[PDB]
Design a protein around this ligand. Structure first.
Ligand SMILES: *[C@](O)(C(=O)NC1CC1)[C@H](CCC)NC(=O)[C@@H]1[C@H]2CCC[C@H]2CN1C(=O)[C@@H](NC(=O)[C@@H](NC(=O)c1cnccn1)C1CCCCC1)C(C)(C)C
Ligand SMILES: *[C@](O)(C(=O)NC1CC1)[C@H](CCC)NC(=O)[C@@H]1[C@H]2CCC[C@H]2CN1C(=O)[C@@H](NC(=O)[C@@H](NC(=O)c1cnccn1)C1CCCCC1)C(C)(C)C
Lengths: 305, 305
């Protein structure tokens, strides 16, 4: 037993990280087959970033303006193209450590593992959720751009995030591996608001199930609720509305514990309206919202990769 | 910026995990060079575990009683020996994926990454602290025994933990890689108390420094304190005493922020005596104690491996 914020094993992704330099800018790239993917702003100067014309800027570059290094091996770039906000560098060598992979776009509230890297070398791994406002609360320093987020399914690495930038609130924004930003953001150095952040209700319920599975039960009550009345209360506390599809994805945890989804929502309703009165759930004084229902099922049933 | 509970990249360790079967018991082993290490209780029946004579039990076993599998590859065991609480199986093949490694014994309050595995296959990675009472608050299910904890230094994997058992409070106990238990425990199915758990004071201070580095400063005050008077207050709240050597290891964070260690202790003293009054630090309502000073420096300066 026990319940931890657990990341996927990172080995498959480590073998894909490389260093990309253009001009005086060095960041990370992802080397899959014979293509290296990295943020397109590797091509800009400080000055360019206030209002860049990435089309015109990339036209001025040649293949030899890009130095890709995999370890001590300098890779030769044989072609460059732009796909939305990511640059794709064709190299003369396919990565032998390429895994079964796919590019996926995650939805708000889904979780992924981040392999934080600097100079093409991994520094650490952690689990994040895509917030409802399409930011992530990561840990990234200067040089971390091009670090990626991923999930594993059986043997297939699903890449879902590439890191691009930090907001003045300290949160992080980036793209999928097709180069489209999560959220309203554009890669230009201007003020760009993230929306209101809300709490990921379906994940809080998943975590309350995890708590029950681990023997923390004090918050279960005799009350129940309809889904509409639950949402009436939850929206007052800036929680995302719970949908019938969320109720269905919590089905496995409901069946395993014997606690109906709407009975768990009645427990969450009382926690919101009265607090925890100095008590904790799974050691935490705040309600946790960065575990999805599938995360709880994987961790409490022992799925391997 | 940002601050996350970050594990080391796990790739070097993944290539070392194998499955070990003896009788009807299957668990994980660690394959380094031509030796596989695993918990010695792989040799016991249910019935044996109330009072096992591991010497006599191992004498009854032969090399062929042990099935070691690395992927689909069945490894041939050519010799077996016991070192304290771990079994060492000699195999006819050195692991090609063996890294520069060493076995280390960590001290209470130090942190490490756990690669949780089942059937010799990794399921996930997370960061843990060795509690002052020599337990860890892990996430381990049936089949996770033989999973290992490790740190990385440059290119060297320092193995420090092998998982053996779970206590009725839900916490976990195991050995170093020389087979000696952390804490007072013995591998027998009897009631064995863990001592009082205390809060790792030097780590809380490290995390308050991390908060300052990330712009959370509301808890800084004009007060200061001697180290003895701080300890007088901290021991009332079941915090470990802070030593002059702890003060020295916080030196780097003090210098980087310009806040003397005893000034930060004065802030911690006020937090303990008055609470947070509904405020948070780095998003948490409770004081975090599972980041060491070196963990904070590595994460906020970007050390790679
Ligand atoms: C990344 O490219 C990298 O690791 N580079 C290696 C070291 C050489 C780098 C790392 C920072 C975490 N990312 C960036 O430099 C991005 C790029 C892409 C978008 C613009 C530039 C700057 N940048 C940033 O992350 C910055 N953040 C901002 O500029 C915010 N700007 C504002 O909030 C703002 C407010 N008022 C006026 C003007 N700007 C972002 C810009 C994009 C929309 C969200 C808000 C810094 C300051 C470097 C974190
Ligand atoms: C591990 O070997 C494994 O993964 N095996 C694979 C599936 C076949 C296995 C996994 C459990 C997390 N570990 C064990 O089975 C260990 C071994 C080593 C020590 C005894 C046995 C049983 N065991 C446990 O972890 C158990 N825990 C206990 O038996 C506690 N016992 C008591 O608290 C207690 C109280 N009153 C009377 C008698 N015992 C431990 C025993 C050791 C000292 C600390 C407390 C279970 C119940 C399986 C978690």
């Amino acid at each position: 037993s026990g319940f931890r914020k657990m990341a996927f094993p990172s080995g498959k992704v480590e073998g894909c990280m490389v260093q990309v330099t253009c001009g005086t800018t060095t960041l990370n790239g992802l080397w899959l087959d014979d293509v290296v993917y990295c943020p397109r702003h590797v091509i800009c100067t400080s000055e360019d970033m206030l209002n860049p014309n990435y089309e015109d800027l990339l036209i001025r570059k040649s293949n030899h303006n890009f130095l890709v290094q995999a370890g001590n091996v300098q890779l030769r770039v044989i072609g460059h193209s732009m796909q939305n906000c990511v640059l794709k560098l064709k190299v003369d060598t396919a990565n032998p450590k390429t895994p079964k992979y796919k590019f996926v776009r995650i939805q708000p509230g889904q979780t992924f593992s981040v392999l934080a890297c600097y100079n093409g070398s991994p520094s650490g791994v952690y689990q994040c959720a895509m917030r409802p406002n399409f930011t992530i609360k990561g840990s990234f320093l200067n040089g971390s751009c091009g670090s990626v987020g991923f999930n594993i399914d059986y043997d297939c690495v699903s890449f879902c995030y590439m890191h691009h930038m930090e907001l003045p609130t300290g949160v992080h924004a980036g793209t999928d591996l097709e180069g489209n930003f999560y959220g309203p953001f554009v890669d230009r150095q201007t003020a760009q608001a993230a929306g209101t952040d809300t709490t990921i209700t379906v994940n809080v319920l998943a975590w309350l199930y995890a708590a029950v599975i681990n023997g923390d039960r004090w918050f279960l009550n005799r009350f129940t609720t309809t889904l509409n009345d639950f949402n009436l209360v939850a929206m007052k506390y800036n929680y995302e509305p719970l949908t019938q599809d969320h109720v269905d994805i919590l089905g496995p945890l409901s069946a395993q514990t014997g606690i109906a989804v709407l009975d768990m929502c009645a427990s969450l309703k009382e926690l919101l309206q009265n607090g925890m009165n100095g008590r904790t759930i799974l050691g935490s004084a705040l309600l946790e919202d960065e575990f999805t229902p599938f995360d709880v099922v994987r961790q409490c049933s022992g799925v391997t990769f």
